[PDB]
Design an enzyme around this catalytic site. Structure first.
Site, PDB file in Angstrom:
ATOM      1  N   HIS A 169      26.224  -6.259  15.827  1.00 34.75           N
ATOM      2  CA  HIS A 169      26.770  -5.609  17.003  1.00 34.75           C
ATOM      3  C   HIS A 169      28.004  -4.743  16.734  1.00 34.75           C
ATOM      4  O   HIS A 169      28.551  -4.132  17.657  1.00 34.75           O
ATOM      5  CB  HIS A 169      27.101  -6.651  18.085  1.00 34.75           C
ATOM      6  CG  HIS A 169      28.281  -7.479  17.711  1.00 34.75           C
ATOM      7  ND1 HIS A 169      28.171  -8.526  16.821  1.00 34.75           N
ATOM      8  CD2 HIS A 169      29.587  -7.385  18.091  1.00 34.75           C
ATOM      9  CE1 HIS A 169      29.377  -9.057  16.689  1.00 34.75           C
ATOM     10  NE2 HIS A 169      30.255  -8.394  17.436  1.00 34.75           N
TER      11      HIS A 169
ATOM     12  N   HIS B  88      32.513  -1.512  17.844  1.00 40.63           N
ATOM     13  CA  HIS B  88      32.148  -2.872  18.169  1.00 40.63           C
ATOM     14  C   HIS B  88      31.523  -2.947  19.524  1.00 40.63           C
ATOM     15  O   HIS B  88      32.195  -2.790  20.524  1.00 40.63           O
ATOM     16  CB  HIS B  88      33.408  -3.767  18.163  1.00 40.63           C
ATOM     17  CG  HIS B  88      33.160  -5.211  18.493  1.00 40.63           C
ATOM     18  ND1 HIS B  88      32.882  -5.632  19.791  1.00 40.63           N
ATOM     19  CD2 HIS B  88      33.221  -6.313  17.693  1.00 40.63           C
ATOM     20  CE1 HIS B  88      32.757  -6.952  19.739  1.00 40.63           C
ATOM     21  NE2 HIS B  88      32.952  -7.392  18.502  1.00 40.63           N
TER      22      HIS B  88
END
Ligand SMILES: [Zn+2]
Ligand SMILES: [Zn+2]
Lengths: 150, 150
Positions: free
Chosen positions: B57, B72
């Site tokens: 992620h 992020h």
């Protein structure tokens, strides 16, 4: 039901308002047009490049589902003799939605070009049952532009 | 003057409104956040992948100019144990702006995730002279999000 996704970023326009009767009159076929905002033309479906105009402003594609699309940048763009276009992909290459095909220079094109509108059309209409055009602002290789039933 | 381009599509938000103090308090560094609208995270600069979280992620990158960015996805996304993320690129790979890094499932993420906001930050701030954040709606690998002087 097939989903055709945006080959380039911008706003969805009416094929009808394309200052070129071949598009505006649906001679070539039906679809929508895009008022470009980005820097590339990407593959709207999964399948294979068919043709790439010498000038690099237009290309053909046929998805795995059996749809033939024709993306053509601007109006009269051939007049630029290939100026503002970098051909990324190759004729007959296997592609997946989003794979860059051509890279362009909007600023340049915006200035030196007749029109920036980019028609996106289905070339094999006779094989088409239903065509649902969408609307709004779209982003490259992400937003759906048309819904087909074939 | 460096130009950082959008890693993903959506709307530019204030790092400050990111429900996670590590971002909101600029601990990690400074930048903007994006309220995602697409299906992938692309390379915002030309350079090299640095790291790719196990979970897929989040990732790091360092441009040729000497900027270290940290993208992020979402907040607490690690909780999903890598669910909704397909890692396209590879750790330490050489990339150019726009090269797909990770592919995600917004719908899924939107539902199963704490937050969707995606912080985009410069990790080596001490090397930064000036940072000009932009605003609005952006599109993947096209729209600039930040202007740096370093
Ligand atoms: Zn032409
Ligand atoms: Zn995380």
């Amino acid at each position: 039901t097939i989903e055709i996704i945006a080959p380039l970023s911008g706003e969805i326009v009416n094929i009808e308002d394309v200052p070129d009767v071949v598009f505006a009159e649906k001679i070539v076929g039906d679809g929508i047009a895009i008022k470009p905002t980005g820097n590339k033309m990407v593959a709207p479906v999964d399948g294979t490049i068919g043709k790439i105009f010498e000038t690099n402003h237009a290309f053909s594609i046929e998805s795995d589902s059996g749809v033939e699309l024709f993306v053509h940048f601007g109006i009269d763009t051939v007049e630029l003799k290939g100026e503002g276009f970098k051909r990324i992909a190759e004729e007959g290459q296997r592609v997946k939605v989003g794979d860059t095909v051509i890279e362009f220079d909007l600023p340049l094109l915006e200035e030196k070009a007749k029109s920036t509108l980019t028609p996106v059309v289905i070339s094999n209409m006779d094989e088409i049952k239903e065509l649902i055009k969408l609307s709004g602002s779209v982003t490259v290789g992400e937003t759906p532009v048309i819904r087909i039933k074939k």
